[PDB]
């Protein structure tokens, strides 16, 4: 929120050169000066016979915004032979990526083409150039003798690059191995020490590199983007890369071990073609020394309010924990087609608040699509999803979108003011712009009035001019300020005071200052940085008894403080800024003496009670809980009376009830002040003597927090009086209860079988399902609908196995769906049958029973366990059932008994029920009628 | 009696209307000071108010153009109309609503445009051969569904640039198949070949002249071609009143937006046409592939139906892409494009089997709710689309337009249109915020008694300090004045304790939060309900203790969404066929069913007990589905009478039942045999046998 947008440094390059496509800071150790580095991928150079070779410009910051090309390579194409170039530097896009660590600068040409020395070719291996002062080596890992597309021919190495802390280069090549992609890391020392201009294919000793894999991974673009950070024990930077076409264009992000290129963690996008992995970034956003992963998907489509898909782009934020598991949330863009998430640039601590910050770009957002950059501050709880500042592009298109935001870089305090600054690139208009961070001031104001209770009959001090005396009081206001970094010694504040603020705009001015005789009074003020809480006093009197009529409405003293930051600016005009979460004003209020007894002091007798609701709070879901409170003042008047309902974490305040016309509609509000959550309700100012209130406070308590007895609310009335200012605190326990609507249901497929069975031939020694009869499926489902969960249950299935030595329903195989195991007391499928590719009731009471018993684990709300029993109709039995024609109802039954719950310290009760499932075997042919 | 009008509208005529649609104003001085000025229309009459001096605007929605629905699409006489009405003037007063209706017809014998956009990678050499006679062969089958048919042709490979293209050796440019011991055309992004013509033979001619090329990497650049075929309306030659089919044929995966960066292409697709006289996509080398969002936007505008005709190896892929571009249909193409014909026909019927309404340029403070009458007279609430339709069928939609507050704009026009249709209902919305009597207002003093206030609509309203009925008291200190009845009663506190009663009225205290209004200072601008720390769930404005929900939210808390998309199943069925979509969430009704869209129901009866009804409906003219007249709609599977049942094939479910005639009927059904669904019935049900 503290980035200056009034006077930002604006740099420019040759039109069409894509000046600004890549940006970074240059912070050499050999100099106390700092510079800007800008890539111009399409820039024309003095390289002989090379068109648009591209260049990298070093830009001064001290005064003149002058940009000078760095001389990496002045030579044109080397030759394989006469009239036969070995390389092609034209349109190589040199400058398309720029990185700098201290005195060393790395720049790359991802479209540099290479002939190879085997055959006439033009393969985009890509190359990089590493410079250090005057020495310049050429790093080009993909330019090896492993040629063609199956090799590293189309690697385009240098497409994305980064240094690690231990001076080590990470390099991405999206085209290696049929566009699978590749990561290659080398020691900077070896990149320099092993350089040899007479060898086009240098091999470095301590090289780390991902290797080719199966062809299903083709066209994934590994190394499209790269970032580095630590994601394991050792303090070694690991490798983070975006793989935007991975997983059928779902996109992925790979993380490799910085020690030996071993795979660590993967991320996967959720919407195809969203280009998840277009941009990556690593930075510790919640001040816990654990680097956090940011992933950009600029073409993500979220669901609009209408319900329709809309392309707004999305950024994934993954918080790293010491456990190894990431804690990930998601962050969506604000404009359609703006491509929010095209660039994610860490800023370090932009406002020096103790937590790092980050910038996300939407380079085609804003009106006239000039480009937007959003700033997000970090905090202990993670990243604050609400942007504290937007940065708008200032240049309109010519032939291409300005693309302001397409490249960015921060985390480098370039003016040494104590605050890191930010470079934004706009390659569409060949522009790069540097925003400086402004110093942040934390100011706390004081305001007190002596005395608080005004007595109209106490005319003490004299009124200037007249011989009259007045009932006066003191108004003392204080200002202390301090801020980190570089900022002035003294500060100019424009403080103004107002008497009876809540009673103006055509109302009567009820309290005035002694001299101005007006409710308003301004004052220039200059305080010193630190702990010098400079204060100033004023004397304000009170109009005569006859002047006004209202004497119950408190007299609100209002103070607001401005800042002459147009004066406190530095030499370059970098004006400070106030902390955004600080109130620019403050209010106190005095009250007039009224009905306070003979002692002139109001001593209330506050007391609060809560009706026994007897409501139960069933563990598992959200519970409607309405507390009824009675707040009465059986003493004198209580100024600024407030009901304080301190609530537990599991509870949220819905609102005060209003449907009841016999219940007071209090003005309540929920504040999270300090580490305590509570509800505050105004009870009157003052809550007059004898006043009694009945109010309803609706709540909803979300639970399922396992073992607990109950939840309690604490209630206490408090006032701003000096004597008996509070009431006795009252606790209200509401018992937690267990309830689990557990049901069991069944079904037969089919639920009937008609005889005779078509094409059924009786075989003495059956082998297949076809030989026995039709398939009959019984499915049993035990489901826990209820709020509460249960931990253990038993399921008992009784199966009609035989009727007088006759097999009926022959069980082949049973399956299980959910937290349960089953066990049949009889051997299932004894005859090893495999293939694939007046109605009389036969229950287990009158038939030989096959029992299947099942132990069931924990079923939470909405979960279930399912038993699939696949059986065959033993046709033989029904054909020669002594006689043929008869109607049978094959009945199976399943019961369940819930035996345990996880909520051990709470009243429970075992749950039991059962259902039955029939398969009716009848004769569709009736030989009567 | 005491109402909302007499407690909020008393301030002024404009705010009187703003209070409620049922409020009315009085512009007659004859009414003595003491009676309300803003009240019900009847109550003002009852208080003897001059009917001419009464301001009572009424919201209306009159139809401006009401052409009837066409019966044939080949109607050369009158212009084909498939939507009625066509234009409605809507006029609303503050916070008022007005419902209306629209009829959409899938007109019989509608004209058809078919642009054949073809992958010409080397793998498609055999396909290019099988479609040599596709034209005439296609013209016959289409004749069964339409008389007026135009077709065209277009081809694509990929961007003629590294790394997608061979650029070395020099012989590779002229012939990408130099090493493959043959010849193929050089690389080309997209070339338009045949403009949409009714001369079907021209297709066959042009196709035989074509030849394939060869790309280096697997993904191609079809998306470029899809975009260009969509927005180059003149080149391709899309007809206004014709169904537009864009047949996309490929056998490989595809490049997507941002892929172009490797090629050095970083200019985002502009969605504009770039196919010129040479009939080649000129921007191919300089502009990136189009994003799915962009393709959707342009397909929707130009009313184009994208048909993904892809081969088995890439079906699941393009299937998933299709779900990101709604309205797009995917078909499975053979390796030689032999079955491209039936694919197109099957796709067409699928396309015209549904009607979904879309809204364009809907004003900010205006909300629309929909009801859908798709089948018979069954009214489906909260739905704006119908499925399972046959050509010739007509659906209906009931719509309600409600405004929040009253936006003081000039004139706004928006569109309610069925997706892919040319015809539409254009709604001209006008807002009646202020009264007409305010036009003849009086600036200050003069007529407003001896004071220096202001006077309009037969009433006065002074300035700072002056709170008198007609400019009486000054900046207070004007004695007790009236004291007044500044409360619903008298034993009750004054001005709801949020102000003092000065000069026969209330003067509400200020508040840092927001605004305190109302006759008795009883209106609260920030006491509305909360759902999760936010007021009105952060989806509604607080108006005197009431939440006024945003364009897509409902409920007293403003936390219930009007969305249905999160209730749609894989069947394209709302909560399957088992529940209803309440607040973007399926509430399951079908016994023992569950899941986010009621997809799961393991204890539901076997599929036999459902298909049976179709057999009783289609093949016996009886059963529940017959009685409710839902046979044709619900039973769409082919039901073929057969002699005997087979054991060969796969997925043969044997279903039997006893009908009203006490005969045992047996039937089996196929599922995804090829995306289809057959159902065979033994033609000789097992009946009783007489003597015997
Ligand atoms: C983040 O996501 C990424 C992307 O999804 C994951 O990366 C993938 O991880 C998997 C799992 O390790 C990798 O699969 C492995 O691939 C190995 C590659 O070997 C290749 O070259 C050799 C020749 O040197 C070839 O033999 C292989 O190809 C052959 O087989 C394939 C089919 O698999 C055929 O298509 C080919 O024609 C060849 O015939 C490869 O090209 C591979 O060696 C490895 O195989 C082992 O593991 C599998 C089971 O996964 C076994 O079936 C197999 O037999 C091997 O394991 C046995 O044998 C070894 C000895 O060889 C014993 O030591 C073992 O005990 C065991 O008996 C496996 O298939 C994949 O390559 C990789 N992809 C990429 C791009 O990185 C990350 O894992 C993931 N990270 C996290 C944290 O989730
Ligand atoms: C770096 O330096 C180079 C020059 O060395 C500049 O490149 C020149 O850019 C201009 C345009 O900006 C080019 O002029 C145009 O040439 C086109 C034909 O040549 C192109 O295509 C052929 C195809 O074989 C190639 O051989 C050749 O290299 C080129 O790629 C013409 O089509 C143009 O004429 C018409 O079009 C334009 C635009 O529509 C109209 O305004 C004209 O009136 C006319 O109708 C035009 O003449 C020039 O050819 C380029 N030279 C080279 C060698 O490529 C870069 O601009 C410069 N870059 C920077 C950032 O400084
Ligand atoms: C929008 O917000 C409101 C307010 O929180 C939600 O209302 C709550 O809805 C739940 C639904 O489960 C209600 O719980 C029900 O309680 C009844 C007893 O009254 C019980 O029989 C049901 O089984 C269920 O548990 C709850 O009453 C209600 N809360 C209150 C007091 O308003 C609403 O659900 C939200 N809408 C959505 C879908 O976001
Ligand atoms: C590559 O190096 C990593 C560590 O940098 C190795 O990871 C180790 O894996 C073993 C199990 O085999 C763990 O017990 C150790 O904790 C890991 N080491 C460290 C330092 O954390 C990994 O084994 C190496 N790769 C291969 C293929 O061996
Ligand atoms: C009468 O009013 C006077 C004037 O306000 C009071 O005198 C001041 O009391 C405050 C208490 O904080 C002191 O700090 C000031 O120094 C006093 N002012 C003067 C001029 O002495 C006084 O307390 C009141 N007396 C009673 C008994 O009501
Ligand atoms: C506080 O001091 C400032 C100057 O710092 C005074 O500002 C004056 O105001 C006028 C109108 O803006 C300027 O044109 C003058 O130049 C200022 N005077 C001076 C001395 O520079 C301001 O009057 C002071 N404020 C109060 C309320 O005392
Ligand atoms: C006194 O401080 C309060 C709280 O900081 C101010 O309230 C904010 O005022 C700004 C500007 O008017 C509004 O945009 C915000 O919505 C208010 N914030 C909150 C929390 O409501 C108030 O403006 C200040 N009063 C004066 C006169 O400066
Ligand atoms: C179903 O049976 C399995 C196998 O006995 C149980 O899973 C085992 O749980 C024990 C707990 O003592 C573990 O030690 C084993 O490691 C588990 N087995 C395997 C293969 O890992 C499971 O508890 C049973 N489920 C229920 C609900 O009874
Ligand atoms: C297409 O999308 C579907 C989802 O609609 C994918 O189906 C699932 O994919 C996930 C992730 O790979 C797998 O874990 C599941 O096993 C798949 N389920 C099903 C129903 O098969 C599918 O993989 C996608 N196919 C392609 C080619 O993109
Ligand atoms: C869609 O159907 C529903 C249900 O009949 C309608 O809901 C009613 O709408 C009227 C106002 O037109 C309300 O007064 C009723 O309270 C509503 N009933 C219920 C149960 O919601 C809805 O109006 C219909 N939509 C349209 C545009 O007619
Ligand atoms: C509008 O809808 C209402 C029900 O809300 C219905 O009774 C009425 O007939 C409809 N009016 C018109 C003209 O569509
Ligand atoms: C208002 O009008 C009166 C004449 O009726 C005039 O005397 C007076 O000056 C005006 N008010 C002010 C503030 O000038
Ligand atoms: Ca590490
Ligand atoms: Ca962290
Ligand atoms: Ca910070
Ligand atoms: Ca700085
Ligand atoms: Ca007292
Ligand atoms: Ca192909
Ligand atoms: Ca083929
Ligand atoms: Na607990």
- Is domain A439-599 classified as CATH 3.40.190.10? no
The whole-angstrom separation of Cα A632 and Cα A623 is 28
**In this structure, which residue's CA is closest to atom 19 in ligand 9?**
B316
The whole-angstrom separation of Cα B462 and Cα B107 is 63
Question: H helices within A194-231, ranges in order?
Answer: none
C-alpha angle A370-A372-A373 in degrees, rounded to nearest 5:
145
Q: Which residues pair with A868 in a beta bridge?
A: A779, A815
Q: What is the SS3 assignment for A81?
A: strand
Q: Which residue among A427, A658, A924 places its CB closest to the CB of B686?
A: A924
Q: Which residue among B500, B602, B689 places its CB closest to the CB of A550?
A: B500
Q: Mind giving me the DSSP string for A435-478?
A: EPBPPEEEEEEEEEEE-SEE-TT---EEPSSSS-EE--EEEEEE
Burial code (b: 16+ CB inside 10 Å, e: under 16) for B517-549 equals: bbbbbbbbbebbbbbeeebbbebbbbbbeebbb
Annotated binding site of A for Ca(2+): 230, 232, 234, 236, 238, 284, 286, 288, 290, 292, 349, 351, 353, 355, 357, 413, 415, 417, 419, 421
Element holding A855 (H helix, E strand) = strand A848-856
Whether residue B594 lies within 8 A of chain A, CB to CB, comes out as yes
The whole-angstrom separation of Cα A807 and Cα A801 is 6
Residue with the two structure tokens 């172009």:
B260
Kindly state if the Cβ of A821 falls inside 6 Å of ligand 8.
yes
The whole-angstrom separation of Cα A557 and Cα B409 is 42
Give the end of a domain, one of B309, B337, B352. B352
Q: How far is the CA of A410 from the centre of ligand 15 (A)?
A: 13
Of the candidates B359, B425, B366, B435, the residue with the CA atom closest to the CA atom of residue B89:
B425
Q: Do A299 and B218 touch (CB under 8 A)?
A: no
Q: Do A747 and B688 touch (CB under 8 A)?
A: no
- Residue in A with minimal Cα distance to B658: A924
Q: What is the SS3 assignment for B582?
A: strand
Q: Are B118 and B124 in contact (CB under 8 A)?
A: yes
Resolution as reported, in Å? 2.9
* Domain match, B169 and B267 both: yes
Q: Do A309 and B530 touch (CB under 8 A)?
A: no
The whole-angstrom separation of Cα A347 and Cα A358 is 5
Q: Do B602 and A175 touch (CB under 8 A)?
A: no
- Residue in B with minimal Cα distance to A94: B264
Q: Are B245 and B114 in contact (CB under 8 A)?
A: yes
Q: Which residues have C-beta within 8 Å of that of residue A70, sequence separation ≥ 6?
A: A55, A56, A57, A58, A105, A107, A131
Give whole-number Cα distances, B672 to A386, A750, A915, B38, in Å: 48, 22, 35, 67
Kindly state if the Cβ of A456 falls inside 6 Å of ligand 7.
no
Of the candidates A647, A643, A642, A623, the residue with the CA atom closest to the CA atom of residue A714:
A647
Does residue B692 have a cis peptide bond before it, meaning omega lies within 30 degrees of 0? Answer: no
Whether residue B568 lies within 8 A of chain A, CB to CB, comes out as no
Kindly state if the Cβ of A583 falls inside 6 Å of ligand 3.
no
The whole-angstrom separation of Cα B108 and Cα B389 is 12
Contacts of B507 in chain A (CB under 8 A): 506-507
The domain of B650 spans 605-692
Question: H helices within B237-387, ranges in order?
Answer: 292-301, 315-322, 340-351
The whole-angstrom separation of Cα B264 and Cα A124 is 11
The whole-angstrom separation of Cα B136 and Cα B151 is 11
Interface list for B 187-216 with A (CB within 8 A): 216
Interface list for B 667-686 with A (CB within 8 A): 686
Collect residues with CB below 5 Å from ion ligand 15.
A 349, 351, 353, 355, 357, 377
Of the candidates B309, B352, B311, the residue with the CA atom closest to the CA atom of residue B331:
B309
CB-neighbour burial class of residue B206 (10 A; exposed 0-12, middle 13-18, buried 19+): middle
Residue B121 among known ligand-binding residues: yes
Q: Which residue among A310, A751, A817 places its CB closest to the CB of B293?
A: A310
β-strand pairing of B149-156 with B112-119: parallel
* Domain match, B283 and B358 both: no
Annotated binding site of A: 230, 232, 234, 236, 238, 284, 286, 288, 290, 292, 349, 351, 353, 355, 357, 413, 415, 417, 419, 421
* Domain match, B195 and B341 both: yes
Instruction: Please state the CATH superfamily assignment of the domain spanning residues A1-438 in this structure.
Output: Integrin alpha, N-terminal (2.130.10.130)
- Residue in A with minimal Cα distance to B496: A665
Q: Which residues pair with B371 in a beta bridge?
A: B381, B398
Q: How far is the CA of A257 from the centre of ligand 4 (A)?
A: 9
* Domain match, B152 and B248 both: yes
Of the candidates A693, A690, A703, A565, the residue with the CA atom closest to the CA atom of residue A621:
A703
Q: Which residues have C-beta within 8 Å of that of residue B278, sequence separation ≥ 6?
A: none
The whole-angstrom separation of Cα B405 and Cα B439 is 20
The whole-angstrom separation of Cα A340 and Cα A357 is 17
* Alpha carbon of A241: minimum distance to chain B alpha carbons (Å): 16
Kindly state if the Cβ of A770 falls inside 6 Å of ligand 7.
no
- Is domain A600-739 classified as CATH 1.10.645.10? no
Q: Which residue among B467, B602, B686 places its CB closest to the CB of A781?
A: B602
Q: What is the SS3 assignment for B164?
A: coil
Whether residue B52 lies within 8 A of chain A, CB to CB, comes out as no
DSSP-based helix, strand, coil % in chain A, nearest 5: 5, 45, 50
Q: Which residue among B168, B257, B606 places its CB closest to the CB of A750?
A: B606
Q: Are A245 and A305 in contact (CB under 8 A)?
A: no
Whether residue B510 lies within 8 A of chain A, CB to CB, comes out as yes
Q: Do A275 and B258 touch (CB under 8 A)?
A: yes
* Domain match, B96 and B23 both: no
The whole-angstrom separation of Cα B7 and Cα B464 is 22
The whole-angstrom separation of Cα B349 and Cα A464 is 95
Q: Are A283 and A306 in contact (CB under 8 A)?
A: no
Give the end of a domain, one of B576, B604, B632. B604
* Token pair in block for residue A359: 């910038």
Number of domains in chain B: 6
The whole-angstrom separation of Cα A443 and Cα A531 is 10
Q: Are A641 and A616 in contact (CB under 8 A)?
A: no
Q: Which residues have C-beta within 8 Å of that of residue A368, sequence separation ≥ 6?
A: A396, A397
Q: Do B602 and A746 touch (CB under 8 A)?
A: no
Q: Within 13 A of A839's CA, how many CA atoms are on the CB side? A: 11
* Domain match, B596 and B651 both: no
Give the end of a domain, one of B330, B352, B374. B352
- Residue in B with minimal Cα distance to A861: B594
Q: How far is the CA of A630 from the centre of ligand 17 (A)?
A: 24
Per residue, the 3-state secondary structure of A779-830, as one string, reads EEEEEECCCCCECEEEEEEEEEEECCCCCCEEEEEEEEECCEEEEECCCCCC
Residue with the two structure tokens 């191609």:
B220
Q: Which atom from ligand 10 is nearest to the alpha carbon of B369?
A: 27
* Domain match, B461 and B396 both: no
**What technique was this entry resolved by?**
X-ray
Q: Are B428 and B87 in contact (CB under 8 A)?
A: yes
| CATH 2.130.10.130 in chain A, residue ranges | 1-438
Q: Are A253 and A263 in contact (CB under 8 A)?
A: no
Q: Which atom from ligand 4 is nearest to the alpha carbon of A262?
A: 1
Whether residue B476 lies within 8 A of chain A, CB to CB, comes out as yes
The whole-angstrom separation of Cα B427 and Cα A686 is 56
* Token pair in block for residue A41: 């991928």
Q: Which residues have C-beta within 8 Å of that of residue B402, sequence separation ≥ 6?
A: B92, B95, B96, B97, B98, B366, B367, B369
β-strand pairing of A238-243 with A314-320: unpaired
Contacts of A779 in chain B (CB under 8 A): 602-603
Q: Are A777 and B603 in contact (CB under 8 A)?
A: no
Q: How far is the CA of A636 from the centre of ligand 17 (A)?
A: 7
Burial code (b: 16+ CB inside 10 Å, e: under 16) for B154-169 equals: bbbbbbbbbbbbbbbe
Give whole-number Cα distances, B187 to A476, A623, B160, B215, in Å: 83, 67, 5, 7
Q: Do B262 and A337 touch (CB under 8 A)?
A: no
Q: Residue B276 sits in a domain of what CATH number?
A: 3.40.50.410
Question: H helices within A215-305, ranges in order?
Answer: 246-249
DSSP-based helix, strand, coil % in chain B, nearest 5: 20, 30, 50
Of the candidates A308, A735, A119, the residue with the CA atom closest to the CA atom of residue B325:
A308
CB-neighbour burial class of residue B464 (10 A; exposed 0-12, middle 13-18, buried 19+): exposed
Q: Are A230 and A164 in contact (CB under 8 A)?
A: no
The whole-angstrom separation of Cα A780 and Cα A894 is 8
Burial code (b: 16+ CB inside 10 Å, e: under 16) for B121-135 equals: bebbeebbebbeebb
Q: Which residues pair with A25 in a beta bridge?
A: A36
Residue A167 CB coordination number (10 Å): 13
* Token pair in block for residue A298: 């600029």
Q: Do A547 and B551 touch (CB under 8 A)?
A: no
C-alpha angle A157-A26-A295 in degrees, rounded to nearest 5:
50
Q: Which residue among B167, B594, B608 places its CB closest to the CB of A862?
A: B594
- The pick from B512, B513, B525, B533 for probing ligand 7's pocket by mutation, whose C-beta has the most ligand atoms within 8 angstroms, reads B512
* Domain match, B461 and B526 both: no
* Domain match, B686 and B675 both: yes
* Domain match, B613 and B586 both: no
The whole-angstrom separation of Cα A670 and Cα A653 is 7
* Domain match, B280 and B342 both: yes
The whole-angstrom separation of Cα B227 and Cα B224 is 5
Q: Are A90 and A52 in contact (CB under 8 A)?
A: yes
β-strand pairing of A252-256 with B304-311: unpaired
Q: Residue B639 sits in a domain of what CATH number?
A: 4.10.1240.30
Element holding A490 (H helix, E strand) = strand A490-499
Kindly state if the Cβ of A857 falls inside 6 Å of ligand 8.
yes
| CATH 2.60.40.1510 in chain A, residue ranges | 600-739
Residue with the two structure tokens 């600036």:
B443
Give whole-number Cα distances, A522 to A525, A526, B513, B540, B566, in Å: 10, 13, 24, 39, 58
Question: H helices within B232-286, ranges in order?
Answer: 233-236
* Alpha carbon of B602: minimum distance to chain A alpha carbons (Å): 7
* Token pair in block for residue B485: 């009845």
- Is domain A740-929 classified as CATH 2.60.120.260? no
Q: How far is the CA of B378 from the centre of ligand 10 (A)?
A: 14
The whole-angstrom separation of Cα B413 and Cα B631 is 41
Does residue B163 have a cis peptide bond before it, meaning omega lies within 30 degrees of 0? Answer: yes
Q: Within 13 A of A93's CA, how many CA atoms are on the CB side? A: 23
Q: Do B259 and A754 touch (CB under 8 A)?
A: no
The whole-angstrom separation of Cα A859 and Cα A851 is 23
Residue B404 CB coordination number (10 Å): 18
β-strand pairing of B499-501 with B459-460: unpaired
* Domain match, B49 and B75 both: no
The whole-angstrom separation of Cα B146 and Cα B239 is 15
The whole-angstrom separation of Cα B237 and Cα B233 is 6
């Amino acid at each position: 929120f503290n980035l200056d947008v009034d006077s930002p440094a604006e740099y420019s390059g040759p039109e069409g050169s894509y000046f600004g496509f890549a940006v970074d800071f240059f912070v050499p150790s050999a100099s106390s000066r700092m510079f800007l580095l800008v890539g111009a991928p399409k820039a024309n150079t003095t390289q002989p016979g090379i068109v648009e070779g591209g260049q990298v410009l070093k830009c001064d910051w001290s005064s003149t915004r002058r940009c000078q090309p760095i001389e990496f390579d002045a030579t044109g194409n080397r030759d394989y032979a006469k009239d036969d170039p070995l390389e092609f530097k034209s349109h190589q896009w040199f400058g398309a990526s720029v990185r700098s660590k201290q005195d060393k600068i790395l720049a790359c040409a991802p479209l540099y083409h290479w002939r190879t020395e085997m055959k006439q070719e033009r393969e985009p291996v890509g190359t990089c150039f590493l410079q250090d002062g005057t020495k310049t080596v050429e790093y080009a890992p993909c330019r090896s003798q492993d040629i063609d597309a199956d090799g590293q021919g189309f690697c385009q190495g240098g497409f994305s690059i980064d240094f690690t802390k231990a001076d080590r280069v990470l390099l991405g090549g999206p085209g290696s191995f049929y566009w699978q992609g590749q990561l290659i890391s080398d020691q900077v020392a070896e990149i320099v020490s092993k350089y040899d201009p007479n060898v086009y294919s240098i091999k470095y000793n301590n090289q780390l590199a991902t290797r080719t894999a199966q062809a299903i991974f083709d066209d994934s673009y590994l190394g499209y983007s790269v970032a580095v950070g630590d994601f394991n024990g050792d303090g070694i930077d690991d490798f983070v890369s975006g793989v935007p076409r991975a997983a059928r264009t779902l996109g992925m992000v790979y993380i490799y071990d910085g020690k030996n290129m071993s795979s660590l963690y993967n991320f996967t996008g959720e919407q195809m073609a969203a280009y998840f992995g277009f941009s990556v970034a690593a930075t510790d956003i919640n001040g816990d020394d654990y680097a956090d992963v940011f992933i950009g998907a600029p073409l993500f489509m979220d669901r609009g309010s209408d319900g329709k898909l809309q392309e707004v782009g999305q950024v994934s934020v993954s918080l790293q924990r010491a456990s190894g598991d990431f804690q990930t949330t998601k962050l969506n863009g604000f404009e359609v087609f703006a491509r929010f998430g095209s660039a994610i640039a860490p800023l370090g601590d932009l406002d020096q608040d103790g937590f790092n910050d980050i910038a996300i770009a939407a380079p085609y957002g804003g009106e006239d699509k000039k480009g937007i950059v959003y700033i997000f501050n970090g905090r202990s709880t993670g990243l604050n999803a609400v942007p504290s500042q937007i940065l708008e592009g200032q240049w309109a298109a010519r032939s291409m979108p300005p693309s302001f935001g397409y490249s960015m870089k921060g985390a480098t305090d370039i003016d040494k003011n104590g605050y890191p600054d930010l470079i934004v690139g706009a390659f569409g208009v060949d522009r790069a712009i540097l925003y400086r961070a402004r110093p942040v001031i934390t100011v706390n104001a004081g305001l007190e009035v002596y005395p608080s209770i005004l007595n109209q009959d106490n005319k003490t001090c004299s009124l200037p001019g007249t011989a009259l005396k007045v009932s006066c009081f003191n108004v003392r206001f204080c200002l202390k300020a301090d801020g980190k970094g570089v900022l002035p010694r003294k500060l100019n504040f424009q403080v103004e005071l107002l008497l009876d603020k809540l009673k103006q705009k055509g109302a009567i001015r009820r309290a005035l200052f002694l001299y101005s005789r007006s409710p308003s009074h301004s004052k220039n003020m200059t305080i010193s940085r630190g702990g010098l809480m400079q204060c100033e006093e004023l004397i304000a009197y009170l109009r005569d008894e006859s002047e006004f009529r209202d004497k119950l409405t408190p007299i609100t003293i209002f103070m607001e403080y401005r800042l002459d930051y147009r004066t406190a600016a530095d030499t370059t005009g970098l004006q400070p800024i106030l902390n955004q979460f600080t109130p620019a004003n403050i209010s106190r209020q005095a009250h007039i003496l009224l009905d306070c007894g003979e002692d002139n002091v109001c001593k209330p007798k506050l007391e609060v009670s809560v009706d026994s609701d007897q409501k139960k709070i069933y563990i598992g879901d959200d519970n409607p809980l309405t507390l009824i409170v009675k707040a009465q003042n059986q003493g004198e008047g209580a100024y600024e009376a407030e009901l304080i309902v301190s609530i537990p974490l599991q509870a949220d305040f819905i609102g005060v009830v209003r449907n009841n016309e016999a219940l007071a509609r209090l003005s309540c509000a929920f504040k999270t002040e300090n580490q305590t959550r509570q509800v505050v309700c105004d009870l009157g100012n003052p809550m007059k003597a004898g006043t009694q209130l009945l109010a309803g406070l609706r709540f909803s308590v979300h639970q399922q927090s396992e073992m607990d007895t109950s939840v309690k609310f604490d209630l206490q009335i408090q006032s701003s009086n000096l004597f008996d200012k509070v009431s006795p605190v009252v606790s209200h326990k509401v018992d937690l209860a267990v309830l689990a609507a557990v049901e069991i249901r069944g079904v037969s497929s089919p639920d009937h079988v008609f005889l005779p069975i078509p094409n059924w031939e009786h075989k003495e020694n059956p082998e297949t399902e076809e030989d026995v009869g039709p398939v009959v499926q019984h499915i049993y489902e035990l489901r826990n609908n209820g709020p509460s969960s249960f931990s253990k249950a038993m399921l008992h299935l009784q199966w009609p196995y035989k009727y007088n030595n006759n097999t009926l329903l022959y069980i082949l195989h049973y399956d299980i769906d959910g937290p349960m195991n089953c066990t049949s007391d009889m051997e299932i499928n004894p005859l090893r049958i495999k293939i694939s590719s007046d109605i009389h009731t036969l229950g287990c009471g009158v038939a030989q029973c096959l029992k299947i018993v099942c132990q069931v684990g924990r079923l939470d709300r909405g979960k279930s366990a399912i038993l699939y029993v696949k059986s065959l109709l033993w046709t033989e039995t029904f054909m020669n059932k002594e006689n043929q024609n008869h109607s049978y109802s094959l009945k199976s039954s399943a019961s369940f008994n819930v035996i345990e719950f996880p909520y051990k310290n709470l009243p429970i009760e075992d749950i039991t029920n059962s259902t039955l499932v029939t398969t009716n075997v009848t004769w569709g042919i009736q030989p009567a009628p | 009696g005491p109402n909302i009008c007499t407690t909020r509208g008393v301030s002024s005529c404009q705010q009187c209307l703003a209070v409620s649609p049922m409020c009315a104003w009085c512009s007659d001085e004859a009414l003595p000071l003491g009676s309300p000025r803003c009240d019900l229309k009847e109550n003002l009459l009852k208080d003897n108010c001059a009917p001419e001096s009464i301001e009572f605007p009424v919201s209306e929605a009159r139809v401006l153009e009401d052409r009837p629905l066409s019966d044939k699409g080949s109607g050369d006489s009158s212009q084909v109309t498939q939507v009625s009405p066509q234009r409605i003037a809507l006029r609303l007063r503050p916070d008022d609503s007005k419902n209306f209706s629209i009829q959409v017809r899938q007109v019989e014998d509608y004209p058809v445009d078919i642009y054949y956009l073809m992958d010409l990678s080397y793998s498609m050499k055999d396909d290019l051969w099988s479609i040599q006679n596709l034209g005439t062969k296609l013209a016959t089958q289409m004749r069964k569904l339409t008389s007026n048919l135009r077709i065209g042709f277009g081809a694509f490979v990929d961007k003629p640039v590294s790394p997608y293209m061979y650029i070395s050796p020099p012989e590779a440019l002229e012939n990408p198949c130099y090493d493959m011991k043959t010849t193929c055309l050089p690389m080309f992004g997209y070339k338009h070949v045949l403009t949409l013509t009714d001369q079907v033979t021209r297709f066959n001619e042009e196709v035989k002249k074509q030849s394939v090329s060869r790309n280096r990497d697997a993904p191609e650049g079809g998306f470029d071609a899809i975009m260009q075929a969509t927005v180059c309306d003149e080149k391709i030659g899309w007809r206004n009143d014709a169904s537009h089919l864009l047949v996309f044929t490929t056998d490989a995966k595809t490049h997507i937006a941002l892929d172009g960066r490797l090629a050095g292409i970083v200019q985002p697709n502009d969605g504009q046409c770039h196919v010129g006289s040479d009939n080649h996509y000129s921007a191919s080398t300089t502009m990136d592939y189009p994003s799915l969002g962009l393709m959707t936007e342009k397909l929707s505008q130009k009313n184009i139906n994208l048909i993904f005709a892809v081969t088995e190896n890439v079906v699941n892929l393009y299937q998933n892409y299709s779900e990101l571009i709604p309205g797009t249909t995917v078909g499975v193409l053979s390796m030689d494009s032999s079955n491209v014909l039936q694919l197109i026909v099957d796709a067409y019927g699928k396309i015209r089997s549904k009607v979904e309404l879309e809204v364009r340029d809907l004003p900010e403070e205006l909300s629309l709710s929909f009801n859908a009458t798709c089948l018979n007279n069954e009214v489906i609430p909260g739905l704006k689309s119908c499925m399972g339709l046959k050509i010739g069928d007509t659906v209906s939609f009931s719509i309600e337009a409600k405004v929040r507050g009253c936006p003081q704009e000039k004139e706004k026009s928006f569109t309610i249109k069925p997706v892919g249709f040319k015809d539409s209902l254009i709604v001209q919305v006008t807002f009646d915020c202020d009264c007409a009597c305010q036009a003849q207002a009086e600036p200050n003093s003069h007529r407003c008694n001896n004071g220096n206030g202001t006077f309009e609509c037969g009433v006065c309203r002074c300035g700072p300090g002056w709170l008198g009925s007609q400019c009486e008291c000054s900046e207070e200190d004007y004695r007790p004045s009236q004291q007044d009845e500044c409360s619903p009663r008298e034993g009750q506190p004054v001005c709801s304790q949020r102000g003092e009663c000065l000069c026969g009225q209330c003067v509400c205290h200020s508040s840092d939060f927001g605004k305190i209004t109302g006759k008795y200072c009883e209106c609260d601008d920030f006491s509305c309900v909360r759902y999760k720390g936010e007021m009105c769930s952060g989806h509604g404005q607080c108006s005197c203790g009431d939440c006024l929900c945003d364009s897509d939210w409902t409920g007293y808390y403003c936390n219930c969404t009007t969305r249905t998309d999160t209730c749609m199943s894989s069947n394209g069925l709302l909560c399957s066929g088992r529940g209803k979509c309440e607040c973007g969430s399926c509430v399951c009704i079908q016994p023992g069913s569950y899941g986010d869209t009621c997809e799961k129901c393991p204890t539901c009866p076997d599929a036999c007990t459902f298909k049976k009804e179709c057999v009783e409906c289609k093949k016996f003219d009886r059963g529940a589905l017959h009685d409710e007249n839902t046979c044709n709609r619900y039973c769409r599977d082919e039901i073929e009478s057969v002699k005997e049942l087979k054991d060969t094939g796969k997925d043969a479910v044997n279903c039997t039942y006893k009908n009203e005639d006490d005969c045992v009927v047996r039937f089996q059904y196929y599922e995804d045999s090829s995306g289809k669904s057959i159902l065979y019935v033994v033609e000789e049900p097992e009946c009783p046998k007489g003597p015997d």
